[PDB]
Amino acid sequence: SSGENLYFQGHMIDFNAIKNAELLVKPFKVGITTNLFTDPKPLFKSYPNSGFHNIEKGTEHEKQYRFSVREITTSDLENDFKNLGKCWQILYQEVSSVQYRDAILKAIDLDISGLKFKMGFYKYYRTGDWISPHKDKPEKILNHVMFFNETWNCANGGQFLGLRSQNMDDIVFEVEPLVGNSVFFEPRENSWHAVRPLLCDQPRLSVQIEIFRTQF
Ligand SMILES: N[C@@H]1[C@@H](O)[C@@H](C(=O)O)O[C@@H]2[C@@H]1O[C@@H](n1ccc(=O)[nH]c1=O)[C@@H]2OP(=O)(O)O
Ligand SMILES: [Cl-]
Ligand SMILES: [V+3]
């Protein structure tokens, strides 16, 4: 039994998990967290279940993918996030805080002060949902992908793949989509990555934060 006392929990995000992320510089500069969230367990159940749009692109497009997305919009800002769980309003407030800017600056020596961001729920949940090898758009100065699954059968597919080239097989590292894990990097001419296609209809739940100066 635990003690009859308080315990410290400064924020939804453990900013020290960003400052002290695993940091690669080759193949490209990318941070990988563990235990990003101070209270991870309830986040899976609170992830939104409606409001998504399915989207796909095939070989006609410069990247291929199949997934569903629900963006945070100005409508959510104006209605005090009434259509989302309270934890997503808190996440938005923390991403928009000086603390997040300070953590990123310490981790990767990039200053995001005064930049803009988008924030969206990206759900992969049908067999074959994936995204093909891509760098991210160069208009993006930083991308931070956060995962929310409480459990994940690795044999399901769905790993984030860090790649050495535009080739699904040229894998340098993998990240499992488990709550607390996240990946943040500046898009560059060689920041190749992908998501291994799902082999099962199992929901793989993420949020992407996209930071930029020029709208895209
Ligand atoms: N966020 C990722 C990221 O991969 C990014 C990049 O390339 O950095 O491209 C983004 C991609 O999701 C696509 N998407 C789809 C529906 C929507 O509402 N918003 C949205 O962003 C778009 O892909 P496109 O169709 O090639 O433009
Ligand atoms: Cl500008
Ligand atoms: V990407």
What is the chain's alpha carbon radius of gyration, rounded to the nearest angstrom?
17
Experimental method, per PDB record: X-ray
* 158 domain-assigned: yes
136 CB within 6 A, ligand 1: yes
| Residues 6+ away with beta carbon under 8 Å from 186 | 29, 108, 110, 141, 142, 143
For residue 80, the CA-to-ligand 1 centroid distance in Å is: 26
How many independent structural domains does the chain possess?
A: 1
- Yes or no: say if 70 and 120 are a contact pair by the CB < 8 Å rule: yes
Q: Which amino acid, 104?
A: I
Q: Is residue 194 part of a domain?
A: yes
Cβ pair 200, 154 in contact under 8 A: no
Identify whether the C-beta of residue 66 lies closer than 8 Å to the C-beta of residue 132.
no
- Nearest-ligand number for the alpha carbon of 116: 2
Q: Is 69 exposed, middle or buried (0-12, 13-18, 19+ CB in 10 A)?
A: middle
Preceding omega of 138 cis (within 30 degrees of 0): no
What gap in Å lies between CA 53 and CA 51, rounded to an integer?
Answer: 7
Residue 177 contacts residue 198 (beta carbons within 8 Å)? no
Instruction: Determine, yes or no, domain membership for 197.
Output: yes
Which atom of ligand 1 is nearest to 137's Cα? 8
CA of 193 to the centre of ligand 3 (A): 6
Decide if 2 is inside a domain.
no
- Half-sphere exposure (CA, 13 Å, Cβ side) for 149? 19
On whether residue 43 sits in a domain, the answer given is yes
Neighbours of 150 (CB within 10 A): 13
Q: Cβ distance 116 to 211 under 8 Å? A: yes
Q: Is 71 within the bounds of a domain?
A: yes
- Identify whether 24 is part of a domain: yes
- For residue 196, list its beta bridge partners: none
Centre of ligand 2 to C-alpha 115, Å, is: 9
Exposure b/e, 28-51, CB count within 10 A at least 16 = b: bbbbbbeebbbebeebeeebeeee
**Is the distance from CB of 205 to CB of 44 less than 8 angstroms?**
yes
Range of the domain at 24: 15-212
- Look up the CATH number of the domain holding residue 90: 2.60.120.620
Q: Is 14 helix (H, G, I), strand (E, B) or coil?
A: coil
Q: Is residue 161 part of a domain?
A: yes
DSSP string, 21-81: -EEE-SSS-EEEESS-BSS-TTHHHHS--SS-EEEEE-TTSSS-EEEEEEE--HHHHHTTT
Residue 87: is it exposed, middle or buried by C-beta count within 10 angstroms (0-12/13-18/19+)? middle
Dihedral sign, CA of 150, 26, 143, 101? positive
Ligand 1, atom nearest to 62 Cα: 26
Ligand nearest to the CA of 211: 1
Which ligand 1 atom lies nearest to the CA of residue 63?
26
Nearest to 65 by CA among 210, 187, 194, 211: 194
d(CA 67, CA 59): 16
